[PDB]
Every structure is written in C-alpha cells, then in structure tokens.
Amino acid sequence: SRLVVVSNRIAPPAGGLAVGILGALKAAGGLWFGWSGETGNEDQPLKKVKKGNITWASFNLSEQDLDEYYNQFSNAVLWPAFHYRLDLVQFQRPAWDGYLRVNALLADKLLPLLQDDDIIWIHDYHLLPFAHELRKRGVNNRIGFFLHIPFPTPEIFNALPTYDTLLEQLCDYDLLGFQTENDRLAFLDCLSNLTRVTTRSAKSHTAWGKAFRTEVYPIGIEPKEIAKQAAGPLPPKLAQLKAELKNVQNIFSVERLDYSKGLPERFLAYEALLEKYPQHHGKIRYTQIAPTSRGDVQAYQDIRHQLENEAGRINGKYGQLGWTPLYYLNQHFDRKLLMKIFRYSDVGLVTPLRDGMNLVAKEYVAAQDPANPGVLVLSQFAGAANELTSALIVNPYDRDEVAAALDRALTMSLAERISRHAEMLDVIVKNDINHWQECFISDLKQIVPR
Amino acid sequence: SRLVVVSNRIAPPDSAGGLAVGILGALKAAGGLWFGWSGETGNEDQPLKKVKKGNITWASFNLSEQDLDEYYNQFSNAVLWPAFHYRLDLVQFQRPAWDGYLRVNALLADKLLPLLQDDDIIWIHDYHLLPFAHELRKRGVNNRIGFFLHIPFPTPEIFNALPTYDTLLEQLCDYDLLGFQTENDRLAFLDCLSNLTRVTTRSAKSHTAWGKAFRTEVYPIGIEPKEIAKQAAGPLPPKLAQLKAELKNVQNIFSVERLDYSKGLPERFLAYEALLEKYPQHHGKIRYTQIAPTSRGDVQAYQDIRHQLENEAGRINGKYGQLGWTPLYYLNQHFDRKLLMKIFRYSDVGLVTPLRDGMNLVAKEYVAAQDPANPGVLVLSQFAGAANELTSALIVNPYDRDEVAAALDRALTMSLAERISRHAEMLDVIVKNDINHWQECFISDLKQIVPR
Numbered sequence: 001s002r003l004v005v006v007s008n009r010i011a012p013p014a015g016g017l018a019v020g021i022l023g024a025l026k027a028a029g030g031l032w033f034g035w036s037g038e039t040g041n042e043d044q045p046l047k048k049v050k051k052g053n054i055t056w057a058s059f060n061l062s063e064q065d066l067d068e069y070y071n072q073f074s075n076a077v078l079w080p081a082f083h084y085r086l087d088l089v090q091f092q093r094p095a096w097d098g099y100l101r102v103n104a105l106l107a108d109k110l111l112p113l114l115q116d117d118d119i120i121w122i123h124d125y126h127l128l129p130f131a132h133e134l135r136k137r138g139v140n141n142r143i144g145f146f147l148h149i150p151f152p153t154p155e156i157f158n159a160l161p162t163y164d165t166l167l168e169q170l171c172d173y174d175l176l177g178f179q180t181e182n183d184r185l186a187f188l189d190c191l192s193n194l195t196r197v198t199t200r201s202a203k204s205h206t207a208w209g210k211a212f213r214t215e216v217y218p219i220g221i222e223p224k225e226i227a228k229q230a231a232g233p234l235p236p237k238l239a240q241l242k243a244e245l246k247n248v249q250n251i252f253s254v255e256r257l258d259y260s261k262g263l264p265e266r267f268l269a270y271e272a273l274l275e276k277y278p279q280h281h282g283k284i285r286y287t288q289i290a291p292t293s294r295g296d297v298q299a300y301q302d303i304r305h306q307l308e309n310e311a312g313r314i315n316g317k318y319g320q321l322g323w324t325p326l327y328y329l330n331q332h333f334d335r336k337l338l339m340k341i342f343r344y345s346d347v348g349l350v351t352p353l354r355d356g357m358n359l360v361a362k363e364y365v366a367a368q369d370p371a372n373p374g375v376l377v378l379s380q381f382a383g384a385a386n387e388l389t390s391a392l393i394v395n396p397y398d399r400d401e402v403a404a405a406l407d408r409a410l411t412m413s414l415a416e417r418i419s420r421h422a423e424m425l426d427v428i429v430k431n432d433i434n435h436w437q438e439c440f441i442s443d444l445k446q447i448v449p450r
Numbered sequence: 451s452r453l454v455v456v457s458n459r460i461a462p463p464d465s466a467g468g469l470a471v472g473i474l475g476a477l478k479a480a481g482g483l484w485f486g487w488s489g490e491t492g493n494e495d496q497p498l499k500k501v502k503k504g505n506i507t508w509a510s511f512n513l514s515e516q517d518l519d520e521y522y523n524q525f526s527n528a529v530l531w532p533a534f535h536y537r538l539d540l541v542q543f544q545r546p547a548w549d550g551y552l553r554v555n556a557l558l559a560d561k562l563l564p565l566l567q568d569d570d571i572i573w574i575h576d577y578h579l580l581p582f583a584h585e586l587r588k589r590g591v592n593n594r595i596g597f598f599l600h601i602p603f604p605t606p607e608i609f610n611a612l613p614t615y616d617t618l619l620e621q622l623c624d625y626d627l628l629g630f631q632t633e634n635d636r637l638a639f640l641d642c643l644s645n646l647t648r649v650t651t652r653s654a655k656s657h658t659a660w661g662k663a664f665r666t667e668v669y670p671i672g673i674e675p676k677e678i679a680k681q682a683a684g685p686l687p688p689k690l691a692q693l694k695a696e697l698k699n700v701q702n703i704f705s706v707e708r709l710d711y712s713k714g715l716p717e718r719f720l721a722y723e724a725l726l727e728k729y730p731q732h733h734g735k736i737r738y739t740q741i742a743p744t745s746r747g748d749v750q751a752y753q754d755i756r757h758q759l760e761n762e763a764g765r766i767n768g769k770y771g772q773l774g775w776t777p778l779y780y781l782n783q784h785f786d787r788k789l790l791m792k793i794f795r796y797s798d799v800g801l802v803t804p805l806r807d808g809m810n811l812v813a814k815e816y817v818a819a820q821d822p823a824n825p826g827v828l829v830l831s832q833f834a835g836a837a838n839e840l841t842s843a844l845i846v847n848p849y850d851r852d853e854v855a856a857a858l859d860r861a862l863t864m865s866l867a868e869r870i871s872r873h874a875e876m877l878d879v880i881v882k883n884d885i886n887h888w889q890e891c892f893i894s895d896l897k898q899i900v901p902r
C-alpha cells in the first residue's frame with residue numbers, strides 16, 4: 001500500500017536521506033510532500049511532477065510563516081534545545097503560534113492528497129505537531145515519525161515553555177523512530193515525567209490512552225555509491241596537490257558551519273597537537289571545509305567570525321614561510337568531490353558537541369581505499385559513535401585527548417588502520433540506507449491502525 | 451668630541467637593526483657612551499649595567515612596573531604614538547600617565563648625569579624623551595644636545611589636541627638641534643610652535659622661541675646598502691633554499707613590519723582581496739606573505755588591530771583559498787633582519803603601504819636587497835616618509851584599495867627593463883643618502899652649535 005513521505009525540504013528531479021526516502025517510495029509507490037523554499041506567493045496550486053511510481057508535490061510559505069516557523073521556532077528554539085543549548089533558545093510566543101499555524105497549513109494541503117489505505121512517514125523536528133493535526137482532520141492512518149536530531153533528557157527538554165503540548169502531540173504518531181537508544185529513552189523519560197506511561201513489549205506504550213510504539217533506526221549510507229564516487233579520477237588540481245603532499249598527511253573535516261559541530265573546539269584541538277607534538281610540524285595539515293548554514297542568525301554568524309579569527313591566530317603562531325598548518329575554507333564543495341577528498345585524506349576529524357548521527361563519519365569510512373584507509377577520530381557525542389566502535393572515540397571537551405587521538409591516527413600502522421576501517425565498514429554495510437528505510441516501513445506496516 | 455647617545459633601548463654587541471648601525475658608526479668615530487633602558491622590569495635598585503669595548507661603553511638600567519606602565523605603555527605608546535600618527539581617537543590621556551612620563555625622564559637624567567663630561571656631545575632619540583633636554587638643563591648641563599624624532603610630527607590641528615602640547619613645545623626648545631625625518635615634520639613642529647608663541651627664524655632653520663636658540667633640520671634615516679646587498683646575496687638556510695626552488699612558478703608579494711595600526715595592515719589585506727577579486731588570472735600563481743611580529747601587546751589598541759588582522763587573514767583565505775592554494779600567509783613572528791634581506795631578494799614584489807610612517811626602513815631595505823640584474827618591485831604608500839625619496843617606486847594611496855590592487859598587478863607583470871630602471875633609480879637615491887651619511891650629518895651639525 002502507498003507511502004506518503006513528508007519532509008520540510010525535498011529534492012525533485014543526491015544525499016543520504018533522499019536516497020532512503022526514494023527507496024521506500026520505489027518499493028511501495030507513493031508521493032513526497034514538502035516545501036520548495038523561496039517564499040513570495042503562497043496562494044497558488046501545488047507544484048506537482050511525476051516519475052511513475054512516485055509524485056513530488058511542493059508548496060510555498062509567506063515570509064511571516066517562514067520567519068516564525070522555520071527561522072524562529074525550528075532553528076532557534078527546537079534546534080538549540082535539542083542539541084543541549086538552552087542558552088541559545090530564543091522563545092517568543094508569536095513564533096510558537098506560527099509553528100502550529102504552519103503545521104496546520106501543511107496538514108490542510110496534505111489531507112486531499114491522502115487515501116485511506118496509505119502509510120504516512122513524517123520527518124524531523126519541524127513537524128512534531130503534524131500527526132496531531134492529521135488526527136484532528138480525521139486521518140486514522142499508520143503515521144510514523146523519525147527524528148533526525150537528538151532528543152534531549154528531561155532536565156533540558158522540560159525547559160521549553162511548551163514541552164507538555166509537544167509531548168502530547170507526539171503521542172498521536174503510531175510509530176516514533178529515533179537515531180539512538182538514548183534518544184528513544186530520553187523521549188520516554190520526558191513522557192514519564194509529565195504523565196503515566198504503560199509499557200509491555202520493550203517498545204509498545206500508552207499515554208493518555210493514546211497507543212504508540214518506539215524504536216531505534218540509525219540512519220545510514222549507500223556504501224557502494226560512496227566507494228564509486230570516491231574512487232573516480234581526481235580533477236587535475238587535486239591530482240597536483242596529492243603528488244605535492246607525498247610526505248604531508250592530511251586531516252580533514254567537513255560540515256555545515258553550526259554551533260553543534262564544535263568547530264572552534266576542534267581548532268583548539270589542532271592547536272594542542274601542534275603545541276605538544278612538534279614532531280609533526282611541516283608534515284601534517286588540517287583542512288576544515290565549512291560552508292555557511294543559516295547565516296541569517298546571530299549564533300551562526302558568531303561562530304563563522306570566531307573561526308576566521310582562530311584560523312588566522314593559529315596559522316600566525318605555528319605557520320612558516322613554506323607551511324600553513326590550517327586550511328579553512330568557507331565554501332561549498334560537491335558531494336562527489338568530497339568523497340574523493342575523504343579517500344585521499346589520512347585522518348577524518350568528526351568531533352561535534354552533539355549530533356543526531358553524523359553521516360560524514362559514515363561517509364568518511366565508506367570512501368576509504370580499504371587497502372590503505374584513513375583513520376576516523378570521532379566524538380562520543382555523535383550518534384554514529386554507538387556503531388562506529390572502532391573509530392578513535394574522543395571527548396571534544398578535552399582538547400588534549402583529541403590531540404592525542406590525532407597523534408595516534410597519524411602514526412597508526414597499516415595493519416591497525418585496515419582492522420579498524422574494515423570493522424566500521426562492515427557495520428555501515430550491514431545497516432545501510434536501504435536497510436534503514438526497510439526496517440522503518442516494515443515496522444510501520446505491522447501496526448494495526450486505529 | 452665624545453658622543454653620548456640616549457635611546458629607550460640600546461644594543462650591546464651580542465642582530466643589528468637599522469638605527470643601531472647608525473649610532474654605532476657615530477660612537478665608533480667619536481668614542482663615547484650609549485645609555486638606555488635594559489628592556490627589563492624589576493630590580494631598579496641595583497647599579498647601572500656597564501660594558502665596554504675599545505672606544506665605547508654601553509649602560510642600562512631597569513624600570514619599575516609602575517614606571518613602565520605610565521611612561522612607556524601609557525604616555526609614550528597610548529598618547530604620543532597614536533597622536534603623532536594622526537590617531538586622536540586612540541589617545542588615552544590621563545594625568546598620572548603624564549606625571550609618570552616626566553618622572554621617568556627626570557630619573558634617566560639623574561642616572562645619566564654622573565657619567566657626563568664637559569665636552570660631550572649628546573644625541574637623544576625619539577618621542578619617549580621629548581622632555582630630556584629640559585631635565586638636563588635644569589641639572590646644569592650646558593653641553594650641545596641634539597634630538598632626532600624617528601616618527602612624524604603632526605600638524606597643529608592634531609598636535610594641539612594633546613592636553614600637554616604646550617609643555618611639550620616648551621621643553622623641545624631646550625635642545626640645541628632638532629632633527630626630523632621629512633621637511634613636513636620639521637615644518638609641522640615649527641607651525642605648532644608659532645601658534646603657541648612668537649618664533650624668530652633666520653635662513654629657514656635657525657630659531658629663537660622664548661629667548662631660547664635652536665636649529666631644525668631634516669635627516670631622512672637610511673640603510674647600509676653594501677651590508678644589505680652582502681646579507682641579501684648570501685645563501686638561504688637549507689629549508690628556505692628548498693622553498694625558493696619549489697616556488698619557481700609562484701610570484702611572491704612580501705611585507706614585513708611590526709603589527710602596528712600605523713602600518714595599515716587590514717587595509718593592505720583588503721587591497722590583496724581586491725587583487726584576487728578583480729584580477730583572477732593571478733589565482734594559484736601568486737602568494738602574499740605578511741610578517742608581523744607583535745609589538746606593544748600590553749596596549750589595548752595594539753591587541754585590537756592584531757585581532758582585526760587575524761580575522762581578515764582567516765576571512766580572505768576562507769573565501770579565495772583552494773585545497774592546494776593559500777593566497778595569504780600571515781606570520782605573527784619575528785624574523786632575523788639578515789634572513790629578511792635574503793627573502794626580499796627572492797621576492798618579486800615588496801608591499802610597504804603604511805597609513806603614516808616617519809620613514810620606513812623596510813622600503814629602503816627592500817630595494818637595496820634586490821639583485822640589480824633581476825630586481826623586484828616596490829609598491830609604496832605616499833604616506834611613508836620614504837616616498838619623498840623613493841619616487842620611482844609604484845606610489846599608492848592605501849585609502850583606495852583598488853589603486854593598491856592595480857599597482858600590485860602592475861608590479862607582478864612589469865618587464866625586466868622597467869624593473870631595472872625603477873630599481874636603479876631608487877638604489878642610487880639610497881646609496882647617496884645612506885645611514886653613514888645620516889649620522890655624519892647629524893653629528894657634524896651638532897658639533898657646530900656653540901654651547902650655552
């Protein structure tokens with residue numbers, strides 16, 4: 001029976017999430033409903049396009065709906081709160097209202113597209129209230145939810161002025177999917193603090209008489225397509241650089257420029273490597289790629305400027321006439337080129353302060369030449385650390401521990417690099433993006449609808 | 451006869467800078483004494499530290515932490531330095547700083563007095579010691595005393611903002627001879643003096659104010675061209691020889707100075723940005739290296755400009771950098787002067803664009819250091835005192851970042867014939883007015899004065 005996916009952004013006629021949604025839709029046949037974000041004329045029909053099994057369908061938002069829904073409540077209350085940064089939340093009631101109003105707009109426009117024996121799969125924190133809004137319009141359907149980001153423990157979550165409403169609305173889903181067991185446990189603990197919840201099958205619950213199930217589905221990667229892209233011919237100037245850096249090892253990071261990512265702390269870790277391991281001077285380099293994300297907002301502009309300052313400071317202290325220790329690039333690179341960069345790099349530095357999963361970590365390992373692989377240094381606060389147990393796991397709050405991991409990665413024998421890489425690769429191959437989506441859809445299909 | 455020189459720092463035998471070679475040439479001809487602050491804080495009780503080699507004696511004292519803060523960090527570097535560099539917005543006048551400034555000048559005069567002899571000629575250097583002739587006169591010293599100001603002297607509209615400008619002018623007139631880097635500095639001093647009090651002037655350079663006789667003169671400081679050429683032609687240290695060879699297909703734009711707000715370093719970085727933006731043919735084929743050792747890092751305005759500069763390095767490299775190409779190499783590090791001559795030689799462009807500079811020896815070093823048969827190009831701010839004499843440089847206005855960018859492009863593509871012609875003309879000017887000439891003229895003029 002049909003699959004209806006809804007997600008805040010979509011891609012028409014790719015990246016980690018899109019390939020999982022596309023696979024679920026290919027097997028079932030369906031429709032992918034979401035925003036096509038450029039505002040300006042909300043009052044037109046849905047922009048519909050069709051392949052064969054599936055139809056994309058998109059809508060626009062007013063500049064008020066966008067400021068209050070996405071720029072304010074999603075990106076400046078939920079995003080900071082869920083990544084353990086209450087000091088960064090910017091709660092204002094007109095923004096909570098706008099959040100509900102937009103979830104209600106989206107539900108009005110989705111109602112007519114739905115059919116009775118459909119299955120519905122909602123994605124991420126922008127749409128916490130969405131199932132509630134569907135139940136109010138009479139849709140009884142199997143609806144599942146997947147949260148891509150962390151779910152915070154009670155002491156953090158309960159600080160949100162509207163936490164009790166958010167919890168009530170989330171129990172309108174039949175299935176709630178999370179990246180890790182601790183996220184699933186945190187949600188249940190928040191729920192248990194507000195109201196009595198009855199459990200009976202490890203993962204089948206009741207609360208306020210509403211029935212639902214929880215489960216862990218750690219999002220994954222397409223390892224064959226990554227390996228293919230990574231292995232392809234370097235564009236000329238990158239072939240030049242690789243043969244120029246024969247004796248220089250490369251430590252590489254890429255991510256969206258976001259405060260969850262701990263980029264300043266990462267620069268400090270590299271500084272500590274340079275400070276305490278002078279053997280490496282002139283023979284390593286750290287390259288951070290960090291394109292500007294949501295630069296319209298103060299917390300993000302603050303980190304960009306801090307990174308500029310820190311690149312300058314660190315290079316100014318440790319640099320030489322013929323050696324720049326830190327390459328900081330505030331630029332977007334194509335996913336395909338990045339896979340090649342991962343392969344040619346010697347160490348992958350993925351140390352966010354808090355991350356739902358972090359695909360870069362999985363991508364980095366998939367892209368390696370398995371005969372000569374690089375080493376993953378990974379933060380224990382990334383959700384990928386629960387499975388990538390053979391990465392060098394570190395606490396980014398201890399810059400010297402991060403530095404010692406980097407030193408160890410830089411000196412690691414081929415035998416140990418193979419052993420560690422092959423162990424992580426086996427794990428990402430077995431829980432691949434195809435596996436992720438199939439597990440969630442099969443669980444969702446099992447639920448008897450109300 | 452015997453020369454006594456005082457300056458805020460001195461240099462005992464065991465890395466000789468530009469001013470130091472001038473002073474030493476002076477002292478080696480006359481014999482004499484070099485007296486000044488040791489650079490050390492603490493233990494000011496203990497005797498003067500004296501060393502002697504042949505004809506010369508070096509003598510230093512320590513200062514107390516409070517003396518240093520008020521006299522050096524505050525008044526010298528937070529009032530006089532920003533005011534004389536046309537930065538009223540950075541002056542931090544407070545009365546305790548001024549009293550400290552006078553207290554330290556008096557103290558140095560007290561420590562110097564027992565060491566003087568009747569026939570000594572006395573040469574005082576720089577803005578730290580504006581009151582020093584005055585302190586010497588009230589201690590009964592009748593000797594010929596000359597002053598040289600190494601930095602610009604600002605016009606009345608700026609100088610007169612200093613709450614103590616009047617006392618400064620009165621004290622400067624107790625020198626028998628006052629020397630300046632440029633004619634505009636000399637004139638600005640005289641203009642300030644004429645606005646306070648009636649000055650009688652004969653033949654442009656001989657003056658009376660308040661019944662006190664003194665002379666003024668211009669002595670643009672220079673370099674030792676033959677020593678620089680020797681140093682510059684010497685082999686690079688192996689790691690740097692390797693580097694020069696690896697950069698065959700890369701033109702180097704080079705700059706070096708103290709990390710000071712007078713030097714216009716952010717405006718310079720902005721000019722390089724404009725080069726990279728508007729002249730993309732240079733991408734991957736040029737490099738701009740800025741050497742900028744921290745200077746006076748206890749002073750708030752200096753920490754500010756350092757943080758501003760770091761931000762701009764990161765921003766610019768963040769925007770124009772590539773995986774295999776960093777456009778801007780910023781090094782907050784001191785380099786030995788001898789090594790720098792060699793780096794100037796292998797470089798293709800010298801970028802010296804201060805917002806205000808008494809002279810700027812780096813500009814003169816740069817030209818002297820070039821291979822005259824394959825010379826680099828100097829891009830020079832019209833606001834360095836050096837621009838008065840380095841007329842064949844590519845002269846630019848740093849307030850117009852696109853003009854600086856165009857001069858960098860012009861420098862990067864200049865034919866060998868034009869580079870030789872410009873270089874030879876500049877080199878001739880700096881050979882005819884070298885550091886030996888500078889000190890010999892100052893000393894000759896000072897011996898001429900009839901002591902009170």
Ligand SMILES: O=c1ccn([C@@H]2O[C@H](COP(=O)(O)OP(=O)(O)O[C@H]3O[C@H](CO)[C@@H](O)[C@H](O)[C@H]3F)[C@@H](O)[C@H]2O)c(=O)[nH]1
Nearest residue numbers: 016148219255256291332333334335355356357358359360
């Ligand atoms: O310049 C660039 C920069 C990045 N990329 C790609 O962006 C993706 C980054 O995904 P990643 O999961 O590591 O981080 P994230 O952006 O926070 O997404 C959230 O959602 C993810 C999905 O569940 C979850 O893993 C994560 O913890 C969430 F916070 C990854 O596929 C990169 O290759 C790129 O193509 N070019």
Ligand SMILES: O=c1ccn([C@@H]2O[C@H](COP(=O)(O)OP(=O)(O)O[C@H]3O[C@H](CO)[C@@H](O)[C@H](O)[C@H]3F)[C@@H](O)[C@H]2O)c(=O)[nH]1
Nearest residue numbers: 468600671707708743784785786787807808809810811812
């Ligand atoms: O890392 C480094 C950085 C610099 N140097 C050397 O320091 C000297 C800088 O002298 P320069 O005259 O260019 O500037 P400045 O520091 O302001 O000195 C003042 O006084 C100078 C003398 O009258 C006058 O030209 C100037 O306008 C005044 F502001 C020059 O000889 C460089 O080669 C170095 O050896 N290592």
